[PDB]
Write an enzyme that holds these catalytic residues in place. Structure first.
Site, PDB file in Angstrom:
ATOM      1  N   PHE A  24       0.799  -1.216   0.000  1.00 23.45           N
ATOM      2  CA  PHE A  24       0.000   0.000   0.000  1.00 23.45           C
ATOM      3  C   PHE A  24       0.835   1.271   0.000  1.00 23.45           C
ATOM      4  O   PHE A  24       0.266   2.366  -0.041  1.00 23.45           O
ATOM      5  CB  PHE A  24      -0.945  -0.016   1.206  1.00 23.45           C
ATOM      6  CG  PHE A  24      -1.529  -1.374   1.484  1.00 23.45           C
ATOM      7  CD1 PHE A  24      -0.965  -2.206   2.442  1.00 23.45           C
ATOM      8  CD2 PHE A  24      -2.622  -1.833   0.763  1.00 23.45           C
ATOM      9  CE1 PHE A  24      -1.495  -3.462   2.689  1.00 23.45           C
ATOM     10  CE2 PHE A  24      -3.157  -3.085   1.006  1.00 23.45           C
ATOM     11  CZ  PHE A  24      -2.592  -3.901   1.970  1.00 23.45           C
ATOM     12  N   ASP A 139      -2.732  -1.386  20.134  1.00 24.76           N
ATOM     13  CA  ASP A 139      -1.762  -2.194  19.400  1.00 24.76           C
ATOM     14  C   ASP A 139      -0.351  -1.959  19.950  1.00 24.76           C
ATOM     15  O   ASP A 139       0.643  -1.975  19.211  1.00 24.76           O
ATOM     16  CB  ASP A 139      -1.846  -1.885  17.899  1.00 24.76           C
ATOM     17  CG  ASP A 139      -1.127  -2.900  17.034  1.00 24.76           C
ATOM     18  OD1 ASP A 139      -0.999  -4.082  17.433  1.00 24.76           O
ATOM     19  OD2 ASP A 139      -0.683  -2.496  15.937  1.00 24.76           O
ATOM     20  N   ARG A 143       7.266  -3.760  18.624  1.00 25.88           N
ATOM     21  CA  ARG A 143       7.382  -3.506  17.191  1.00 25.88           C
ATOM     22  C   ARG A 143       6.762  -2.178  16.777  1.00 25.88           C
ATOM     23  O   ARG A 143       7.045  -1.704  15.670  1.00 25.88           O
ATOM     24  CB  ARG A 143       6.734  -4.637  16.380  1.00 25.88           C
ATOM     25  CG  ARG A 143       5.207  -4.623  16.394  1.00 25.88           C
ATOM     26  CD  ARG A 143       4.590  -5.747  15.544  1.00 25.88           C
ATOM     27  NE  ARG A 143       3.229  -5.411  15.137  1.00 25.88           N
ATOM     28  CZ  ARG A 143       2.149  -5.608  15.889  1.00 25.88           C
ATOM     29  NH1 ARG A 143       2.262  -6.153  17.098  1.00 25.88           N
ATOM     30  NH2 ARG A 143       0.951  -5.254  15.432  1.00 25.88           N
ATOM     31  N   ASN A 144       5.937  -1.568  17.631  1.00 26.49           N
ATOM     32  CA  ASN A 144       5.350  -0.255  17.371  1.00 26.49           C
ATOM     33  C   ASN A 144       5.974   0.838  18.238  1.00 26.49           C
ATOM     34  O   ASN A 144       5.349   1.879  18.477  1.00 26.49           O
ATOM     35  CB  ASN A 144       3.831  -0.304  17.566  1.00 26.49           C
ATOM     36  CG  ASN A 144       3.134  -1.126  16.487  1.00 26.49           C
ATOM     37  OD1 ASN A 144       3.628  -1.226  15.366  1.00 26.49           O
ATOM     38  ND2 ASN A 144       1.983  -1.708  16.818  1.00 26.49           N
ATOM     39  N   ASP A 157       2.941   4.233  15.307  1.00 27.37           N
ATOM     40  CA  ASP A 157       1.927   3.358  14.726  1.00 27.37           C
ATOM     41  C   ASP A 157       0.585   3.516  15.439  1.00 27.37           C
ATOM     42  O   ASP A 157       0.106   2.636  16.148  1.00 27.37           O
ATOM     43  CB  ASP A 157       2.394   1.902  14.755  1.00 27.37           C
ATOM     44  CG  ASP A 157       3.483   1.632  13.748  1.00 27.37           C
ATOM     45  OD1 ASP A 157       3.133   1.356  12.577  1.00 27.37           O
ATOM     46  OD2 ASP A 157       4.676   1.710  14.118  1.00 27.37           O
TER      47      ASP A 157
END
Length: 281
Positions: A24, A139, A143-144, A157
């Protein structure tokens, strides 16, 4: 009265290198000139490819609108957006060391306990701010979290963040079952992030399936202590995993506790017993 999200003119942005790619859009490292052509800042540039749906658009620009409301050391800074021109871009501060989980895996064992706890303190400060600004992240995971070259960790994120009104193994039990996402379920996720940091990015619950993680939590199982983990830090992450969400600490409590430990750092020298998984005689 939301904060003005700056619309950046394309002549002010240069893309220097392609550093990630999805179906995307791509992520670039670049430069941004500001005010006007007198200062230059390195930036991350996230694009949205042509053909995007209305949902993709509201999600993409909406993420920028959320970031634009925040001004905190431990929250990724929004420089602005390009939406009048295509492809549309979200332009944020550049974070040289990338995502925290991958960074720790590539630095396994190279940080001090005081440094790791300092990373957790910064993450918690940003989450406290986020929560008190009336957002739930939903979330939160290593990783964020992004890391700049000064080792400062910042929450990123926000695509799934919501104004108050997703991997199973980071999510609180009441958010899995009842979709009840609150700052208290972010606290559960933070406890997982604490375990991720102190293990240098170990996979939570290892080879267990999602169903098996739900079975274990439901039975009262919790992640065991990381190696060389301060007893205080393990008790704190354990409290984040209280089944009853009202019994979990607030981010306010977490930041306060971590500050007290950092202020008297010999407090961190009492280690929780590491459960030996193998025996060598």
């Amino acid at each position: 009265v939301l904060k003005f999200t700056t619309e950046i003119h394309p002549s002010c942005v240069t893309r220097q290198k392609v550093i990630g790619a999805g179906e995307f859009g791509e992520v670039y490292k670049g430069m941004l000139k500001t005010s006007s052509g007198k200062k230059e800042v390195p930036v991350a540039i996230k694009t949205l490819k042509a053909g995007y749906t209305e949902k993709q658009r509201v999600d993409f620009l909406g993420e920028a609108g959320i970031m634009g409301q925040f001004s905190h050391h431990n929250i990724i800074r929004l420089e602005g957006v390009i939406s009048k021109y295509k492809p549309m871009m979200i332009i944020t501060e550049y974070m040289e060391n990338g995502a925290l989980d991958k960074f720790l895996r590539e630095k396994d064992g190279e940080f001090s306990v005081l440094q790791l706890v300092g990373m957790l303190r910064g993450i918690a400060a940003g989450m406290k701010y986020l929560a008190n600004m009336n957002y739930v992240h939903r979330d939160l995971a290593a990783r964020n979290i992004l890391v700049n070259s000064n080792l400062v960790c910042k929450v990123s994120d926000f695509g799934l963040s919501r104004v108050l009104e997703i991997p199973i193994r980071w999510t609180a039990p009441e958010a899995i079952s009842y979709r009840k996402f609150t700052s208290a379920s972010d606290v559960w996720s933070f406890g997982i992030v604490m375990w991720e940091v102190m293990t240098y990015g170990e996979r939570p619950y290892w080879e267990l399936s999602n169903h098996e993680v739900m079975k274990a939590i439901n039975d009262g199982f919790r992640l065991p202590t990381p190696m060389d983990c301060p007893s205080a830090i393990y008790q704190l992450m354990m409290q984040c995993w209280q089944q009853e969400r009202a019994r979990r600490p607030k981010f306010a409590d977490i930041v306060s506790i971590l500050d007290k430990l950092i202020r008297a750092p010999d407090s961190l020298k009492t280690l929780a017993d590491f459960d030996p998984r193998v025996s060598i005689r």
